[model samples]
Target: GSSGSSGVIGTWDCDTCLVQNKPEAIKCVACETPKPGTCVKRALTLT
Candidate 1:
């Protein structure tokens, strides 16, 4: 189901390219690989 409304800010390190990316990005900017569930930062609260 759809959850947070805001974007999760942080760098998404790609295993293939090892490059960082913004939350607004969908795929790796270096190798164009799909997101592999990286990063630990968050934009929404969980309380």
Candidate 2:
């Protein structure tokens, strides 16, 4: 089953599905990234 972003996880009988099929994959993995999400705002206030 394809999630919001998905790739097939399966055993190949003969060859790589990706190389053969060339399917459009949502490979972006924002969820798994160790880095913080989105850009941070610049410092607005000076103490």
lDDT of all predictions, in order shown? 0.67, 0.29
Instruction: Summarize candidate 1's per-residue lDDT along 4-28 as a digit string, tens digits.
Output: 5434446656678788877678887
Q: Which stretches of candidate 2 lie over 4 Å from their true place?
A: 1-34
TM-score of 2: 0.14
Backbone clash pairs for candidate 1 read none
lDDT string for model 2 (1-47, tens) is 24563223432121322232212222223232122225532344533
Off by over 4 Å in 1: 1-9, 37-45
- Evaluate model 1: give its TM-score: 0.53
Worst 10 residues of 1 by lDDT: 1-10
Using lDDT as the measure, the top candidate is: 1
RMSD of each candidate?
8.4, 15.7
Work out candidate 1's RMSD over C-alphas.
8.4
